[PDB]
Write a protein that binds this ligand. Structure first.
Ligand SMILES: CCCCCCCCOCCOCCOCCOCCO
Ligand SMILES: CCCCCCCCOCCOCCOCCOCCO
Length: 360
């Protein structure tokens, strides 16, 4: 969602320099004087690459299986009265794109895999005094799932096996291996695609030690989406912002998620306010995988990944400004043993992001 991309999303739940954050922590609403609006997008360009071979001897190599993506974000925030404020946003919190050929040998465990999420958020917060503040949010999730699968060298495998058995010596015995082996890769073995809505509620608590230092604890509820039933995980997060100097600040957060398996994310970053116009941000983060070294899938790319980030912010003048963010993710090369297959998945990625914000 913009600036956050250049800070590796470090302390997203305590930073308040632009309305983007309210969607991450509703309590942060009591942090804005005048209505603020921000919009933009993040262009996502991956590089997932499966490798290795099959017991069929056929290649299980698949270059670039993760498509590019453009992700929009739009946040609006405004005060109501000295003790209340409200806000809305349109973003995306989950997704996933994977595409192999339909003739791929592991076609059964790696056909087409799409999943887009649109989160519609509305929420409010109440300021309890100079220090504490609290927020509650409702969420609308539009999910579009697409899941294709074929039988790669499956019939061959079935067949080669048979050929190692007595039924080998004919009598509808060899005709068998043949019939199995005479099965096309592109023989679609699974096509489920649908659209449905999800509903969840998130909340937050914002504690500030002063206009220069604050901490937080946010909570994101699980969201079940029924088509097959897809569950977006519930989340917990703690973040801190320290305005250590007029020109230097620090932000960091620890996030926890339990996919009813579980994983965590850690990020630390620092911004620098050179002057009234310019602002600079750097960030590092690591998100530990929620999937056991044996329950992975070349289909769903994820794996202990790291993040390097850098963003900049030009303020045209007191009311408006634009954010530009860069972010590179490198992935730990792993070993997957899905089905009768065994692959190897590497994958890095680049993120470009821009956002313009305006005050009324
Ligand atoms: C390799 C993908 C990196 C995912 C991080 C993007 C970070 C920002 O937020 C995105 C939020 O919403 C959904 C993401 O897009 C779908 C995933 O990319 C497709 C590759 O399989
Ligand atoms: C010493 C300066 C670095 C700032 C970190 C202080 C943050 C202290 O710990 C908070 C513990 O709970 C949340 C997350 O972990 C901290 C941030 O990650 C740091 C480097 O990987």
């Amino acid at each position: 969602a913009g600036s956050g991309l250049g800070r590796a999303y470090s302390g997203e739940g305590a930073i308040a320099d632009d309305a983007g954050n309210v969607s991450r922590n509703p309590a942060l609403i009591t942090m804005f004087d005048r209505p603020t609006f921000s919009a933009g997008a993040v262009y996502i360009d991956p590089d997932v690459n499966i490798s290795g071979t099959s017991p069929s001897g056929r290649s299980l190599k698949a270059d670039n299986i993760a498509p590019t993506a453009w992700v929009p974000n739009m946040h609006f925030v405004a005060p109501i009265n000295d003790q209340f404020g409200w806000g809305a946003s349109i973003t995306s919190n989950y997704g996933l794109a994977t595409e192999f050929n339909d003739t791929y040998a592991g076609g059964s465990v790696g056909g087409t895999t799409d999943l887009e999420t649109m989160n519609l958020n509305l929420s409010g917060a109440y300021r309890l005094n100079n220090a504490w503040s609290f927020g509650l949010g409702f969420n609308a999730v539009y999910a579009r799932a697409k899941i294709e699968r074929f039988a790669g060298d499956l019939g061959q495998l079935v067949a080669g096996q048979i050929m190692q058995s007595p039924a080998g010596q004919t009598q509808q015995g060899q005709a068998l291996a043949a019939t199995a082996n005479g099965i096309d890769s592109n023989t679609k073995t699974a096509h489920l695609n649908g659209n449905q809505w999800g509903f969840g509620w998130n909340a937050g608590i914002l504690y500030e030690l002063d206009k220069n230092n604050r901490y937080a604890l946010t909570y994101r509820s699980e969201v079940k989406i029924d088509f097959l039933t897809l569950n977006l995980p519930e989340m917990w997060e703690v973040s801190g912002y320290n305005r250590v100097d007029p020109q230097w600040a620090i932000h960091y957060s620890l996030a926890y998620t339990s996919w009813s398996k579980d994983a965590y994310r850690i990020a630390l970053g620092t911004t620098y306010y050179y002057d009234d116009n310019w602002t600079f941000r750097t960030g590092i983060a690591f998100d530990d995988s929620p999937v056991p070294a044996q329950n992975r899938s070349i289909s769903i790319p994820d794996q202990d990944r790291f993040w390097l980030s850098a963003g900049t912010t030009y303020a045209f003048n007191k009311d408006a400004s634009v954010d530009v963010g860069v972010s590179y993710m490198h992935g730990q090369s792993v070993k997957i043993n899905e089905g009768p297959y065994q692959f190897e998945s590497e994958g890095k990625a680049w993120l470009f992001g821009t956002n313009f914000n305006y005050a009324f």
